[PDB]
Design a protein around this ligand. Structure first.
Ligand SMILES: OC[C@@H]1[C@@H](O)[C@@H](O)CN1Cc1csc2c(O)ncnc12
Ligand SMILES: OC[C@@H]1[C@@H](O)[C@@H](O)CN1Cc1csc2c(O)ncnc12
Ligand SMILES: [Ca+2]
Ligand SMILES: [Ca+2]
Ligand code: NI
Ligand code: NI
Ligand code: NI
Ligand code: NI
Ligand code: NI
Ligand code: NI
Ligand code: NI
Ligand code: NI
Ligand code: NI
Ligand code: NI
Ligand code: NI
Lengths: 327, 327
């Protein structure tokens, strides 16, 4: 819990909570050795999500001396794109004053070209396959990169994965994909690339921990708690996380307008503290059709993954607030 | 320019640039004595815009010892409401870490009840009418409060106004109100309450300086300049203004996606530096109909206001960057 670090790669798609997840992982080097990040052109414009990833890496390196690591833009493309207005969030982040501290801009400008050479899917494969320790992959965007690696390399890749902790799906609760052509039963990360999700979630060669809407619905961050970051504004990570949650737009804001979803952050929190939730083994039948139920992750007839259940609000809160006083 | 301060009231509707305007005024006490603020339930939920106003007042009082002042919620209601998603911005701001510094929250919690007793329209009238100096009113929301004061008090009020510097309208360029029932010719602040605008803009008893889209269209803040606030992140006002502009959503973001509108900020900048723009006397015929042209501010047949022209991008930039190093 403080004596040995897990080797971790973050496979993300650049929304505000992807970066909260990144900050939780990177701010806890006693627990997590972050050896790389992948960014997918899903809930962001990949150039923006890439730059924000880079600058956060640079800021942590400067402040707390966490190692620098390779970052790769995936070339995976969507089956179903995220709404364009949502994807702009990483551009907004890239313009934020806490992501434009002069040292971080200078270091990222220097490190950017070497990272631009990487292909994200290939980087994920290379980092896992060449690692001495088995690697924990945290997936907070769609499952396309994991799918590509499993398809290209099979057990040469999956044998080197410790576990895969994924944000996606909706098992016993409704989804969050509301479009003229959908029934509302699907979750967005799955919907973006349903065949990828089908390939990964039911891959018998990896241990998947799934943070579906079942778990994420129960742990919003209330406005009253987001305001708590103000007491820590002298810490860069509090300026970052407080702003990331305060910026919530569209369906990131719950019904009552006084709380926000924290989907990916809870997912990374599990890597820091596995007791934050109980796990249930579940067989899933991923809908890859073009019907209204496309992307649905219902229980199969007759396991694929271990679904997170009843996550601890207090543990989540305490972890996030401690992590964001790190620097 | 540094030897005597203008007495000013800010009559605003709580969008991000309203607060940039507020920060420009309040950060320059050599030039501006801010004696009050009004908040209207237009481009915000008035409770949120009120709280943000209060906390910014409190922060400046703490940091640079600017005086505290009365703040009043207007009870004016719209003819045509702003889009609900846009109005949430002040709620997002109210949750920001730089607007939750513990001292500011404590002081605002203390000062809030006395201010809640105020009626905004009445406060605007009282502050102008009892002021020893003639008062400059900066209006960055709709014209409803000015209209109410002129209707209730006539010259007893207008004789005590130095000038009224207003953000609104579109004279020789298109508007920004795009709805199924509009032709695109109107600007939002006017559209919100066209009869109020008609009453004020052509009131022969006040000198109106109008920052219409003609002027505001030419002074966006580019992403490259918003990023400049990062170099000043140690200053609270840079964290505020940088985030306010970086947060831009919807039609605040220009076509190319690399710049944002700064409508109200330019309007306040004129109070700080009147040479920032050239003024043209223009007679206007405000459309108060329920047709597609409702809220249009075309040139009349045959002056009402002095329209701002060709504002200086460099002066605006230099003023904003200096103001946001104040604290
Ligand atoms: O399905 C949740 C996943 C998480 O991994 C978050 O990054 C948002 N992402 C998509 C998403 C669902 S609603 C919503 C929203 O309202 N804005 C931006 N993104 C989203
Ligand atoms: O017509 C411009 C006035 C200014 O006073 C700004 O506060 C925004 N306000 C309304 C407005 C126009 S487009 C737009 C937008 O996209 N988001 C929020 N507000 C607006
Ligand atoms: Ca995500
Ligand atoms: Ca305004
Ligand atoms: Ni340990
Ligand atoms: Ni170094
Ligand atoms: Ni490399
Ligand atoms: Ni929208
Ligand atoms: Ni695919
Ligand atoms: Ni707490
Ligand atoms: Ni002077
Ligand atoms: Ni005091
Ligand atoms: Ni009073
Ligand atoms: Ni009215
Ligand atoms: Ni400059």
């Amino acid at each position: 819990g403080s004596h040995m670090a897990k080797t971790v790669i973050l496979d993300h798609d650049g929304n505000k909570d992807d970066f909260v997840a990144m900050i939780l992982l990177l701010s806890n080097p006693k627990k997590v050795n972050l050896i790389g990040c992948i960014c997918t052109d899903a809930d962001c414009f990949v150039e923006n999500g890439f730059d924000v990833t880079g600058k956060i890496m640079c800021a942590m390196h400067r402040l707390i001396k966490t190692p620098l690591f390779p970052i790769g833009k995936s070339t995976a493309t969507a089956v179903n794109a995220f709404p364009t207005e949502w994807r702009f969030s990483a551009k907004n982040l890239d313009d934020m004053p806490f992501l434009n501290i002069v040292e971080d801009v200078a270091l990222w400008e220097k490190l950017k070209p070497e990272n631009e050479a990487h292909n994200g899917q290939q980087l994920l494969a290379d980092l896992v396959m060449k690692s001495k320790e088995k690697v924990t992959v945290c997936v907070t965007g769609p499952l396309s990169n994991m799918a590509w690696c499993i398809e290209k390399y099979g057990e040469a890749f999956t044998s080197k994965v410790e576990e895969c902790v994924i944000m996606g799906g909706a098992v016993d609760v409704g989804g969050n994909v509301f479009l003229p052509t959908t029934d509302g039963s699907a979750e967005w990360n799955i919907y973006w690339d349903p065949p990828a999700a089908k390939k990964v979630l039911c891959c018998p060669n990896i241990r998947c921990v799934l943070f579906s809407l079942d778990a994420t619905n129960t742990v919003p961050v209330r406005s009253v708690d987001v305001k708590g970051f103000g007491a820590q504004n002298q810490y860069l990570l509090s300026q970052m996380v407080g702003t990331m949650w305060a910026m919530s737009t569209h369906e990131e804001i719950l019904r009552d307008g006084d709380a926000y979803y924290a989907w990916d952050a809870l997912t990374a929190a599990y890597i820091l503290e596995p007791t934050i939730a109980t796990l249930e083994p579940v067989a899933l039948d991923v809908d890859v059709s073009k019907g209204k139920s496309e992307g649905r992750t219902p229980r199969a007839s007759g396991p694929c993954v271990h679904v997170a259940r009843n996550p601890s609000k207090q543990m989540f809160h305490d972890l996030v607030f401690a992590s964001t006083r790190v620097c």
